[PDB]
Design a protein around this nucleic acid. Structure first.
Ligand SMILES: [Zn+2]
Length: 259
DNA sequence: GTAGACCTGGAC
DNA sequence: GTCCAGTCTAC
């Protein structure tokens, strides 16, 4: 999931857990726990704390408790669900938070790529992994000036630049490909080759795409122009969409609309 | 920048 | 059987 999907999770999960107190924490795949390194310490410190809020920073979810904050990244396939602690768990459930009212928050992740870090609230934003993140795209903090500053400094592809969470936080493979198509820019061109006009246009489309995706509850799949449409005609010019590899990942684009 | 890592299951 | 699907690492 990318920013739109994570934001949809944040909004829907909050009312299902706010106000509940943690009674136990069970871990079935220790590698997911990154800090504290010892999973026994990770579990023990959360017992007795109550959920007070849930925020999002980039692609991360930030569970706010009493003293601590739990920072969770779903990576490629992580997912959360709330259910009765009396029922059998679903396959691939690796971490479970048991509440005093008999319900529980379950974390599932088939590929086991997700991560979890716990810090005191005041230290969360000053320690990894949140410390080095770029600005939120839907905030005044993200502007053309900010994009140009990083752009006019590197020769790597513009797609590689957009996937860099230190530049701006929240974009993944789908929304980077969609934003570049809407702005009319080829994904493989050097970031330093973009003109000032191209930068302003890219910024504008990035904000519009991510904003619209949030409103639609994420993949919005019926509104995709290029992602996963290789071999199909472009919705704007009819030219077949193509797929290659850029920045080490699948890349979709229209050879006529993007230059 | 270009494959491999970490891991598992679906489509061809 | 073989290719495909968010970050970090080593040549
Ligand atoms: Zn086109």
């Amino acid at each position: 999931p990318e920013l739109p999907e994570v934001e949809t999770i944040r909004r829907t999960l909050l009312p299902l857990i706010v106000g509940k107190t943690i009674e136990d924490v069970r871990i079935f795949w220790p590698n997911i726990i990154r800090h504290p390194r010892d999973s026994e310490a990770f579990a023990a410190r959360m017992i007795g704390q109550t959920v007070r809020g849930l925020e999002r920073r980039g692609k991360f979810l930030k569970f706010l408790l009493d003293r601590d904050a739990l920072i969770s990244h779903l990576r490629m396939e992580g997912r959360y669900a709330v259910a009765s602690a009396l029922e059998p768990l679903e396959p691939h459930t690796h971490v479970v938070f048991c509440f005093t009212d008999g319900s529980e928050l379950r974390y599932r992740d088939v590929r086991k790529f997700g991560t979890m870090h716990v810090y005191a609230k005041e230290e969360a934003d000053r320690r990894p992994p949140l410390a080095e993140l770029g600005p939120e795209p839907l905030s005044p903090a993200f502007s053309p000036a900010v994009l140009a500053e990083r752009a006019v400094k590197t020769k790597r592809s513009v797609k590689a630049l957009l996937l860099d969470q230190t530049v701006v936080a929240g974009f993944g493979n789908i929304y980077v490909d969609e934003s570049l198509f809407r702005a009319g820019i080829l994904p493989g061109r050097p970031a330093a080759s973009l003109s000032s006009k191209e930068i302003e246009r890219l910024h504008e489309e990035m904000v519009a795409t991510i904003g619209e995706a949030v409103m639609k509850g994420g993949s919005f799949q019926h509104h995709l122009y290029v992602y996963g449409r290789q071999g199909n005609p472009c919705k704007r010019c009819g030219t077949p969409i193509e797929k290659t590899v850029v920045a080490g990942r699948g890349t979709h684009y229209c050879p006529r609309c993007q230059r």
